[PDB]
Amino acid sequence: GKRVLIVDDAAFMRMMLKDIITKAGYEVAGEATNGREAVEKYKELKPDIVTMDITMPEMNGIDAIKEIMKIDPNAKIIVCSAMGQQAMVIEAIKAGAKDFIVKPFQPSRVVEALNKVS
């Protein structure tokens, strides 16, 4: 019930999230570097929670959210954004995302987001 699928292009960003997740009592189900891989990993890993980076519009994290929602209408997705992205975040929430966190990652915020989505 604490398995997370981490989706982010940057290896360092995923590392920072893995560290927070582990220290917070959750576990890394797996990771993806893009949205296409995210949907594939969602089907195979069946994670409880997904963290989806949407900081890079070209990466199309929003489309991956919609695809994951189609695969599982009960999916629990936490969007990872940057400052100034309120419009994209609101759009992601309407697409099905449950909550959001903002970079750079603040452990206490990530921990509460994980706890609350559960």
């Binding site: 975040v89 929430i93 903002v102 706890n115």
Partner: protein, 86 residues
Amino acid sequence: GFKTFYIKVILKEGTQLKSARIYLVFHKLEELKCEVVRTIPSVEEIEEEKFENEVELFVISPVDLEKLSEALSSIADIERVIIKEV
């Protein structure tokens, strides 16, 4: 016999993307089928972040205090949610 509640959402000083954080509150209220009657500041100002660390709402709710408070407490990154039946 619906109910009307006064709600005050208080955010922490550093809270990022406050308009999106507040949107989550509006999204939760709509999920519970509540109707927002009035807000402080106006909806336009909220969407433009023309506020500090708190937002006030007056809503008509088909659910009671306990379920409403439980639902609003499920939102992360909120210092406090003040709810009073009116």
